[PDB]
Amino acid sequence: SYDRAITVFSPDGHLFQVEYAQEAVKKGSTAVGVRGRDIVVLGVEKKSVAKLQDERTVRKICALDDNVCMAFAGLTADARIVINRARVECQSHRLTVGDPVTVEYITRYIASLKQRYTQSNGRRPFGISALIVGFDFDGTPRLYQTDPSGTYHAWKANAIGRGAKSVREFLEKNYTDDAIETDDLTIKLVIKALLEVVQSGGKNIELAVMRRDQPLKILSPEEIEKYVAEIE
Amino acid sequence: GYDLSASTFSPDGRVFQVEYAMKAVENSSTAIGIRCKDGVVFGVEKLVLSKLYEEGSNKRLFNVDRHVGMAVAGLLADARSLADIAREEASNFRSNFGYNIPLKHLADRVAMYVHAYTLYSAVRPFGCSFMLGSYSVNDGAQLYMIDPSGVSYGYWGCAIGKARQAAKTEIEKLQMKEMTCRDVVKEVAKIIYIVHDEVKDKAFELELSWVGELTKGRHEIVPKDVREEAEKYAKESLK
Amino acid sequence: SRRYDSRTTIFSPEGRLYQVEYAMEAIGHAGTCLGILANDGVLLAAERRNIHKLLDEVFFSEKIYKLNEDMACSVAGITSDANVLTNELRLIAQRYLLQYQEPIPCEQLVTALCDIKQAYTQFGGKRPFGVSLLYIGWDKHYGFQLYQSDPSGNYGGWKATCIGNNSAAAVSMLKQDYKEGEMTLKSALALAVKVLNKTMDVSKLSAEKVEIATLTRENGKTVIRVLKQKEVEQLIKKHEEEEAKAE
Amino acid sequence: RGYSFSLTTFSPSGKLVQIEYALAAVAGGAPSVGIKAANGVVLATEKKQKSILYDERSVHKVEPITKHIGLVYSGMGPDYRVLVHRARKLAQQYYLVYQEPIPTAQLVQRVASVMQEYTQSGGVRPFGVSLLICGWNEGRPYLFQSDPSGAYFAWKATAMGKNYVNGKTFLEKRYNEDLELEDAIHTAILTLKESFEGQMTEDNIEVGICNEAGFRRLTPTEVRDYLAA
Amino acid sequence: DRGVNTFSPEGRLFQVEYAIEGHKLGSTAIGIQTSEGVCLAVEKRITSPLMEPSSIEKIVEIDAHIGCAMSGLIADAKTLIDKARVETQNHWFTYNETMTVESVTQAVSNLALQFGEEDADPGAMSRPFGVALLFGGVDEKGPQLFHMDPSGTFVQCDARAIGSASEGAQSSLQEVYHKSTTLKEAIKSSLIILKQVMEEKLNATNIELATVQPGQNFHMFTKEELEEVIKDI
Amino acid sequence: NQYDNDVTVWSPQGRIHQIEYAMEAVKQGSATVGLKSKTHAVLVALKRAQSELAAHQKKILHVDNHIGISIAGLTADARLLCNFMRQECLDSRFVFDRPLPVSRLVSLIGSKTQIPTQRYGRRPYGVGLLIAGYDDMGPHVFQTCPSANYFDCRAMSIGARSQSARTYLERHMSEFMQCNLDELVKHGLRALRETLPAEQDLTTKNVSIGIVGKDLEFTIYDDDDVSPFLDGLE
Amino acid sequence: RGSSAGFDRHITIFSPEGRLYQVEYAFKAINQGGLTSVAVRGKDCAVIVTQKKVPDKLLDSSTVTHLFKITENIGCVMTGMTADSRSQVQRARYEAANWKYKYGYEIPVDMLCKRIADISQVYTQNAEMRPLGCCMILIGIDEEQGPQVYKCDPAGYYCGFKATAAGVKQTESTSFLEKKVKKKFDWTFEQTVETAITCLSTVLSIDFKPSEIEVGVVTVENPKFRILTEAEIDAHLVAL
Amino acid sequence: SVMSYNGGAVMAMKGKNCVAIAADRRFGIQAQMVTTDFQKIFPMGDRLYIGLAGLATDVQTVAQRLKFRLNLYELKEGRQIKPYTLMSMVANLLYEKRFGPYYTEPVIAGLDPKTFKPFICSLDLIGCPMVTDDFVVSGTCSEQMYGMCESLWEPNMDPEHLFETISQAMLNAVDRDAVSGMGVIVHIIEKDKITTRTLKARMD
């Protein structure tokens, strides 16, 4: 058995392993999410598609349950482990209490795992950041965000990855109860919020929307293509 | 970089960790032992640091079994650990085989235990050496001495401590093979008072013990009348 | 003890993983391997690295390793780790078949292996495997497929990939000669031969410096068949002829 | 209770220098030679004692594993003994399960798996020895070689230890595919003779053969006749 | 270089000395004990106007008569909070009565220093915690307020302040406090000092406040009552 | 400069710097004083001034009906040791239906404290103690050390600046035996007054007093229960 | 000569030459005690001789012995570190008893030697412990072959010999014995004690007294391991 | 008894360079039939079949574990298994559960992959292999098919006469058993052919 302290304190009370994990998550592809009136949407950037892949196998937007979905930035191999553990937890909760989970319940579970890997012997921390969205039985949309340290908040709209430093300033100024009225209004909002960070031009973006019905619907390339023309 | 572990030979084939655990003993106060026809006699110069302590604290003579004594030198905590191990070894032997353990067997068992701590990086060698002593109608008196490395030899008189050099030199002029315990006890008192330094250390305590035929093979502490007389004789001899 | 520890599973001051970065450069210098997907099946085509005259060709192949009745792979990097990985893949496929009484899908196989590759980078103190893999297969849901893993533990589906040595230029020339949907198995073989002919520093191929396998469906059955020296020689002759004729 | 971290790691260029150093250790052993003929294999070693005091009969370098397999080595003898013991155990387990003698290829695969385990566990070094395996099953002779890393090959004629480069450079020329076992022994002996720095004797070398009837090491009385020519 | 357990030439335990420095980088909290109850108050320290302020919970409830306010590593504090809840429920289950603030502080302080990297446990801590706590509540002797450190030393206070501005917050609390307060003047002064030391403007959504008193349970202030109090001040 | 980190490394002089540093930790604390007479033993401690608002501390704890201790050093380690001693006395009373001798208790404590000082990746308990008890043989004032050896003494003081209290103690030890309890306690409070600087005298809330004796269990005296003892110290 | 890279001289890992320096240091540890042994086997006898240098005259020299008994017909002589050698003797005794318990007959000398050698090979591989700094020599009578003489070492190498010599003066003490295996089978009769004593004395110039050596014996006439008395040793010494 | 709880009857017979195996189809519980298409013969190899009788759950479990191990073996080695090797592997599998055993008695019949020499064998519940040269039986009507085979068997038979004999034996054997019947399936393993047939039996 391997029992060593990998992440330990430092002069001035820093955790260098966690700081390095965050410096790593600061290099992924940008993700953006907003919370609508009756819809929730996410959006991820594709650095390059390479003209030879199969996009069905490199998707960064999964579905943990009927009403919960997520999108990450960082390291895909770690993201996969976290996602599968969250799926098993959702099934256990359904089995024991006879009701689908809340968004905050699964956010707490994920953050607890991430924190546990910062204080155990013989482990390094996870190198991913997640954005979790969904609806509940009340009919209230939610949007959260976790960190490699185990801390999570609730936000109106947020952006993770590289270029988030400008996506956040853009979204701060432009977010208002007017761009929220309708789905084809919020979706164009998200698209123009992502486009000024995509310096390639055009659509190198994946965009998934989730409404109270027809869950985790994913916009087709042609459909997403139409919106870009409308903006211009 | 070879001074930090008991798993590293020096380029010349030495183990400096054991060599240092030996210095730990090579600067501690002296204890002697003397073998006789009838029995054995232990003697230790017990140091009294300040007035505050009660006399009787930090004893260096233990009772490992009803016929085995023991005198120690070095780190007293390690010494007490070893004394518990030895008590454990003797009791198990009696419960397995139905009679008392021979001193030769006990010393062999404890030396193996001590040597097991000289091979690994996860532990450190003990920092105390000690002497044993018994008396049995079968083999008569006996005396052994174990080192921090785990070597155990038989002796006629041993002088573990800091004044080993001066202690051994004076004990060799004794003719112990013919004396008796009553005639040896006085000699132990005298030689300890001679080897004792009265400058660095100002005050010291003296305690004695013996195991022989006069105690019917049971280890004891020398009674108070014998001790007072011994001290007086030593003082008279010293001038 | 702490003095002798090498700390294989820690982050770098910039968020990197140095042991994985070094295993990737190890895999950089291995023998060239390449795969190509088509309408009626997939194909692998590796390069023979040990060409000594005094060797023996007892095995039906050198870098193929049929994993199941429907799949097969190929490796680049360290043979000793490759053997461990291949044994593990076979065991995973048989456990699936025992539980469900149906063959396993290719994506599930690749996933179950990449989990093991990832668990070697997060805890344990060991070093990671220095091996990259390519897979080919056929299942009920998606038909002919072609994947690829790497030491870190992330995979991805492709249509024409390449690992090993000079894989950069291999993929560069693959991008300009592959047309989605219209490629048949014969045009696939032609392109594979003509890519291998260049991305190898030698003057020209030898039909024994290469190793070629295919995969097809015939009469409701999968057939995995390693091509023969005469067939390869004929293909090389065909390549020699047409190329010569153009100029 | 033991270390849990690896002692073999990757370098900025992707090398494993502990394995490279175990190979440098192997490159300083005694010469070994194997040659596969049309109806058998031949292993021949240099068993050169330090002085006349050493009793030659007590220790052997050519050992059997089953009734049809035998091997030699180059590198470190105390490691070679561990490998020999585990190979014997592996063969016995196979026979216990299948009631059949193990084939040479399965034997080599299991041995190389053990040697590979010693490159990635915690607190150990790799073996400093390469092997040369011999066998005969289903009417065919085999000859493999195993490295300190865990990679095995298959040959027709190879050479280990000191002066292996010139050994195989000389071995390539003479080798014929129609060679009989008795005429292959001459070439094996001759190859050893190229780099011996001394005078050949019935106690300077060891020789084992394997054909249809099983494995056995030749006796000095027979090595004498073979050396007479 | 060193291990986690390693004394210094002054016998100081380097890792604990660093975990203590990890607290001068948190947001200030304040507790005050009266003859009519206790009050807790903590700054929320909002980052950007897009973050929901109802999602920063730094004052939790341990039981119907005990509450807690933390500072430091909010990710670390959650295991302590959970274990305190579980211990209180066990005590109720076994003895059919409510635990005491002293017993809860003492049981929580026994998890600190329980770290190491060899022969510790199957799954054990690898470093000390980085959270300081503040317990409040009423029991068979009245309102009480305790304080906990990462070293494991717990004291009993009547007006304590923890955080990054405490060396300035106590310099005012020692002048303001007296043994003849009421909870209302306590609340007023606890708000005045916060306003004194904070960087933003003390309005009704970037602070938090709760109170326990001998009559009622643990109760949190509302954005109605809180606003009225702030406006009244 | 490479022997001062691990507890399993000897120096070229045969010393253990880690054990040393763990002792220098114990010197940081506030002073304590113990002493015994013909029939009673007594502990007196000085609760340190932490701040202008906090209740001082707990420096004297019950171990059993006849045993009580007083600590100086790491309080977490101190109460970790106190729990072990309490379980020891409870186990004793369960098996033999009688109390425990203070000497055997201190033996168990020393044997337990010694083990950490020898293994890799472990550290010594950084706390010194002072035990007081009554038994068939009368009072006892044992003292322990981070290095597991313990002592037996008529009167001992541990803590910062306790050199002056130790000098006073030996200088006046000539009469501790005959003296009465009131006389005995005052001798303790004077000695404890010695270590305080010039600007401070004993008040009524920065001192604690423990007492065990022939016909009396171990008791601790609260803030204003120590008033009958400080009335005469002029 | 042989370069170094990393932790080569501190743990058992390969040097840039594949040399294992940490095992070349236990050989130097062998020469720390300052003794020398010599074993010679004859046509019907095996003999051990050992220096007996006690430091000064307060020890009970009846306890300072380098000769040990493993079973009734096997004897041994150690050289190197004393406590190490005691642990190795205990291990050999346990191995020899377990063999008889398991298989019903008495263990041979070469089998016991091989067991001790593979026990030491493990210390040469794992990094948490150190090799034992001692050598070993064994003798005994094999019912099939006759006399046998074997020797291990800290590296795990366990050859068999016609006449050995271990200790501080190993090289020259073997150079002497080299010249005498030329003819007469090195005096293959019960008086190889003469050869052993002569070889021990030639390069030490002591002309030992009747009590500065120990000798042990096994014979085909009486197989058990016997330790010859002082008088017997004196008679041989007197004849010299 | 437990091995009489689902019924069943298996039979193998040897000819001149040919083997034959047969079974019945009924699947039922103590005294009531459920289906009539239960499979009791499994194709372990190109010319290597195995027939299982006894408790049906254990029939299915043992068949599945055996297929597991045989797939792994043929992937690791590189060739097909021999009839003798398969028998030893099955005996080992059954003996691993010596205490708490499977309630199933297997039967093996194949052809040597290089000499085309037949092979029949049966094992007991614990793994005792007995190889014969005429025929083996297993099931609830063992005595009936013993009486039939001893009388009807001849040496060096053709595939035609072998089929006639094994069918005529199975029919009259199961016509006198209460918990066997509902039809019989016969496999004929020749050198280059494997012919399967279904006989018309009684359905009462």
Cα–Cα distance, D90 to D93 (Å, whole number)? 5
Determine contact, residues C216/C226, Cβ cutoff 8 Å: no
**Alpha-carbon Rg for chain B in angstroms:** 18
How many CA atoms lie within 13 Å of B149's alpha carbon, on the beta-carbon side?
18
| Beta bridge pairs of residue G123 | none
Contact with chain C for residue H60, Cβ under 8 A: no
Residue G49's nearest CA partner among G73, G29, G65 is G65
C15 and A122 in contact by Cβ < 8 A? Answer: no
Can you list the pairs that H153-156 forms with residues at least 24 positions away whose Cβ atoms lie under 8 Å?
A: H153/H13, H156/H15, H156/H16
Determine contact, residues E39/E31, Cβ cutoff 8 Å: yes
A81 and C16 in contact by Cβ < 8 A? Answer: no
What domain count does chain H have?
1
CA H129 to chain centre: 14
Cα–Cα distance, F154 to F141 (Å, whole number)? 6
Strands H184-189 and E219-220: unpaired
Determine contact, residues B31/B160, Cβ cutoff 8 Å: yes
In a mutational test of the A interface, the residue from D3, D4, D6 whose CB has the highest number of chain A CBs within 10 Å is D4
Which residues in chain A have their CB less than 8 angstroms from residue D120's CB? none
- Name the CA dihedral angle for E103, E104, E105, E108, rounded to a multiple of 10 degrees: 120
The answer for A 2-21 residues in CB contact with D (under 8 A) is 2-3
Q: Do chains A and H touch (3 or more CB pairs under 8 A)?
A: no
φ/ψ of residue F218, rounded to 5 = -70, 125
| Beta bridge pairs of residue H95 | none
Single-letter amino acid code for the residue at E188: K
Residue H47's nearest CA partner among H126, H139, H115, H144 is H115
Tokens of E221: 């202030």
Domain that holds residue H110: 1-204
Determine contact, residues D7/G13, Cβ cutoff 8 Å: yes
Residue F104's nearest CA partner among F140, F128, F154 is F140
What does the DSSP assignment read for F5-29? S-TT---TTS--HHHHHHHHHHTTS
- State which fold the C18-246 domain adopts: Glutamine Phosphoribosylpyrophosphate, subunit 1, domain 1 (3.60.20)
Q: Which chains touch H (3 or more CB pairs under 8 A)?
A: C, D
Q: Do chains B and H touch (3 or more CB pairs under 8 A)?
A: no
Contact with chain C for residue H85, Cβ under 8 A: no
Residue C68's nearest CA partner among C96, C40, C94 is C94
CA C240 to chain centre: 26
Could you give the strand order of the β-sheet that contains H41-45, starting from the edge strand earlier in sequence? H41-45, H48-54, H104-111, H118-123, H129-131
Which residues in chain D have their CB less than 8 angstroms from residue G164's CB? 53
| Beta bridge pairs of residue G37 | G50, G166
Tokens of F217: 């269990």
Residue F69's nearest CA partner among F147, F138, F137, F158 is F158
B24 and F10 in contact by Cβ < 8 A? Answer: yes
Cα–Cα distance, H147 to H170 (Å, whole number)? 11
Determine contact, residues E39/E210, Cβ cutoff 8 Å: yes
Determine contact, residues A133/A143, Cβ cutoff 8 Å: yes
Looking at residue G40, which CATH number applies to its domain? 3.60.20.10
Determine contact, residues H105/H124, Cβ cutoff 8 Å: yes
C-alpha distances in angstroms, B31 versus B23, B43, B229, C26, H68? Answer: 16, 6, 20, 65, 74
CA F111 to chain centre: 18
What does the DSSP assignment read for E185-225? HHHHHHHHHHHHH-SS---TTSEEEEEE-SSS--EEPPTTH
Cα–Cα distance, B171 to B157 (Å, whole number)? 7
Region for H183 from its dihedrals, namely left if φ exceeds 0, alpha if ψ lies in -120 to 50, beta otherwise: left
CA B222 to chain centre: 16
Tokens of C30: 């291995």
Contact with chain D for residue A48, Cβ under 8 A: no
Residues ≥6 apart with Cβ < 8 Å to C176: none
Return the CATH superfamily for domain A1-232: Aminohydrolase, N-terminal nucleophile (Ntn) domain (3.60.20.10)
| Beta bridge pairs of residue C143 | none
In 10 A of CB C235, how many CB atoms? Answer: 21
A1 and D5 in contact by Cβ < 8 A? Answer: no
B54 and F154 in contact by Cβ < 8 A? Answer: yes
Cα–Cα distance, H98 to C1 (Å, whole number)? 47
D100 and H85 in contact by Cβ < 8 A? Answer: yes
Which residues in chain C have their CB less than 8 angstroms from residue D140's CB? none
Q: Out of C123, C152, C156, name the one closest to residue A122 (CB).
A: C123
Contact with chain D for residue G125, Cβ under 8 A: yes
What does the DSSP assignment read for G23-83? HHHHHHHHTTS--EEEEEE-SSEEEEEEE---SSTTB-GGG---EEEEETTEEEEEEE-HH
Using DSSP, state whether E35 is helix, strand or coil. coil
Residue E101's nearest CA partner among E153, E144, E147, E38 is E144
Domain that holds residue G188: 1-240
Number of helices (H), then strands (E), in chain H: 4, 12
How many CA atoms lie within 13 Å of G172's alpha carbon, on the beta-carbon side?
7
Determine contact, residues F145/F113, Cβ cutoff 8 Å: no
**Alpha-carbon Rg for chain F in angstroms:** 18
- Residue spans of alpha helices (H) in C101-228: 106-119, 167-175, 185-199
In a mutational test of the A interface, the residue from C4, C7, C11 whose CB has the highest number of chain A CBs within 10 Å is C11
Q: Do chains H and D touch (3 or more CB pairs under 8 A)?
A: yes
In a mutational test of the G interface, the residue from C1, C2, C3, C4 whose CB has the highest number of chain G CBs within 10 Å is C4
Domains of chain C, residue spans: 18-246
Cα–Cα distance, C51 to C205 (Å, whole number)? 13
Q: Which chains touch D (3 or more CB pairs under 8 A)?
A: A, C, G, H
Cα–Cα distance, F162 to F32 (Å, whole number)? 8
Residue C158's nearest CA partner among D199, A56, B170 is A56
Contact with chain G for residue C4, Cβ under 8 A: yes
Tokens of A204: 């190198």
The answer for C 191-220 residues in CB contact with A (under 8 A) is none
In a mutational test of the H interface, the residue from C70, C71, C95, C97 whose CB has the highest number of chain H CBs within 10 Å is C97
| Beta bridge pairs of residue B97 | none
In 10 A of CB E126, how many CB atoms? Answer: 22
Residues ≥6 apart with Cβ < 8 Å to F172: F187, F191
Tokens of F143: 């003292």
Looking at residue F214, which CATH number applies to its domain? 3.60.20.10
Determine contact, residues B30/B45, Cβ cutoff 8 Å: yes
Q: Out of B26, B50, B77, name the one closest to residue F110 (CB).
A: B77
φ/ψ of residue E77, rounded to 5 = -65, -15
Sign of dihedral through CA atoms B12, B14, B15, B20? Answer: negative
Residue B154's nearest CA partner among B45, B33, B43 is B33
Opening angle at CA E48, ends E43 and E53, nearest 5: 50
Note the residue count of chain C. 247
φ/ψ of residue B121, rounded to 5 = -90, -15
φ/ψ of residue C119, rounded to 5 = -65, -10
What domain count does chain F have?
1
How far away is chain F from the Cα of B179, in angstroms, using its nearest Cα?
Answer: 37
Cα–Cα distance, D221 to C128 (Å, whole number)? 53
What residue ranges in chain G does DSSP mark as E strands? 36-41, 45-51, 67-71, 74-80, 134-142, 146-152, 163-167, 213-219, 226-227
- Name the CA dihedral angle for A96, A101, A102, A104, rounded to a multiple of 10 degrees: 80
Cα–Cα distance, E35 to C178 (Å, whole number)? 84
- Residue spans of alpha helices (H) in chain C: 18-28, 79-100, 106-119, 167-175, 185-199, 229-246
Contact with chain H for residue C80, Cβ under 8 A: no
In a mutational test of the C interface, the residue from D10, D127, D137, D173 whose CB has the highest number of chain C CBs within 10 Å is D10
C-alpha distances in angstroms, H111 versus A24, D137, H47? Answer: 63, 21, 6
Cα–Cα distance, F73 to F128 (Å, whole number)? 6
Single-letter amino acid code for the residue at F42: V
Q: Out of B119, B156, B158, name the one closest to residue G130 (CB).
A: B119
C-alpha distances in angstroms, C69 versus C93, C224, G24? Answer: 10, 8, 55
Domains of chain A, residue spans: 1-232
Tokens of G109: 């000398």
| Beta bridge pairs of residue A145 | A131, A153
C-alpha distances in angstroms, G15 versus A170, B4, D16, D23? Answer: 60, 21, 13, 11
Tokens of G201: 């004395």
How far away is chain B from the Cα of F160, in angstroms, using its nearest Cα?
Answer: 18
* H helix or E strand, kind and range, residue H104: strand H104-111
Nearest CA in chain C to H69: C94
How far away is chain H from the Cα of C103, in angstroms, using its nearest Cα?
Answer: 12
G160 and D57 in contact by Cβ < 8 A? Answer: yes
Contact with chain A for residue D5, Cβ under 8 A: yes
What residue ranges in chain B does DSSP mark as E strands? 31-35, 40-47, 61-65, 68-74, 128-136, 140-146, 152-154, 157-158, 204-211, 220-221
Looking at residue D91, which CATH number applies to its domain? 3.60.20.10
Determine contact, residues D8/D16, Cβ cutoff 8 Å: yes
φ/ψ of residue A65, rounded to 5 = -155, -170
| Beta bridge pairs of residue F155 | F35
Tokens of E133: 């706590």
Which residues in chain F have their CB less than 8 angstroms from residue B22's CB? 14
**Alpha-carbon Rg for chain C in angstroms:** 19
| Beta bridge pairs of residue G139 | G75, G149
Nearest CA in chain H to C59: H78
Domain that holds residue D186: 1-229
Tokens of B116: 């097991």
Helix axes H56-77, H83-95, angle to 10 degrees: 130
Which residues in chain C have their CB less than 8 angstroms from residue D165's CB? none
Through-space distance between the first and last CA atoms of chain F, rounded to whole angstroms? 52
Which residues in chain H have their CB less than 8 angstroms from residue C66's CB? 75
Instruction: Note the resolution in Å, 1 decimal.
Output: 2.7
Which experimental method was this entry solved with? cryo-EM
> How many inter-chain contacts (B to G, CB under 8 Å) are there?
84
Q: Residue E167: exposed, middle, or buried by beta-carbon count in 10 A (0-12, 13-18, 19+)?
A: exposed
In 10 A of CB C55, how many CB atoms? Answer: 14
Opening angle at CA C91, ends H124 and D150, nearest 5: 115
Determine contact, residues C161/C149, Cβ cutoff 8 Å: no
Nearest CA in chain H to C65: H75
Residue D82's nearest CA partner among D22, D143, D126 is D126
H75 and C60 in contact by Cβ < 8 A? Answer: no
Tokens of E150: 């990462």
DSSP F115: G
Q: Residue D45: exposed, middle, or buried by beta-carbon count in 10 A (0-12, 13-18, 19+)?
A: buried
- Name the CA dihedral angle for A59, A65, A67, A68, rounded to a multiple of 10 degrees: -60
- Residue spans of alpha helices (H) in chain F: 17-26, 75-96, 102-114, 163-172, 181-194
Tokens of D69: 């397999």
Contact with chain E for residue A70, Cβ under 8 A: no
Cα–Cα distance, A148 to A20 (Å, whole number)? 10
Cα–Cα distance, C68 to B64 (Å, whole number)? 70
Cα–Cα distance, G34 to G169 (Å, whole number)? 9
Residue C167's nearest CA partner among C11, C1, C30 is C30
Domain that holds residue F170: 1-234
Contact with chain C for residue A116, Cβ under 8 A: no
Which residues in chain C have their CB less than 8 angstroms from residue H78's CB? 60
φ/ψ of residue A33, rounded to 5 = -145, 145
Determine contact, residues C71/C135, Cβ cutoff 8 Å: yes
A2 and C158 in contact by Cβ < 8 A? Answer: no
What domain count does chain D have?
1
In 10 A of CB H35, how many CB atoms? Answer: 10
Cα–Cα distance, B236 to D18 (Å, whole number)? 73
Helix axes C79-100, C106-119, angle to 10 degrees: 130
Q: Out of H77, H84, H92, name the one closest to residue D97 (CB).
A: H92
| Beta bridge pairs of residue C225 | C214
Residue F218's nearest CA partner among F64, F76, F102, F115 is F64
- Residue spans of alpha helices (H) in E96-182: 101-109, 166-176
Residues ≥6 apart with Cβ < 8 Å to A201: none
Give the largest Cα separation in chain B, rounded. 57
Which residues in chain C have their CB less than 8 angstroms from residue A51's CB? 175
C-alpha distances in angstroms, E214 versus E61, E97, E105, E138, E179? Answer: 16, 16, 20, 6, 18
Which residues in chain G have their CB less than 8 angstroms from residue D128's CB? 14, 18
C-alpha distances in angstroms, B8 versus B14, B17, B121, F169, G127? Answer: 8, 9, 9, 50, 10
How far away is chain D from the Cα of A118, in angstroms, using its nearest Cα?
Answer: 20
Single-letter amino acid code for the residue at E131: V
SS3 sequence of H36-53: CCCCCEEEEECCEEEEEE
* H helix or E strand, kind and range, residue F216: strand F216-221
Q: Out of E3, E50, E120, name the one closest to residue A157 (CB).
A: E50
- State which fold the E1-233 domain adopts: Glutamine Phosphoribosylpyrophosphate, subunit 1, domain 1 (3.60.20)
Tokens of B55: 């006399």
Which residues in chain F have their CB less than 8 angstroms from residue B123's CB? 8, 118-120
What domain count does chain B have?
1
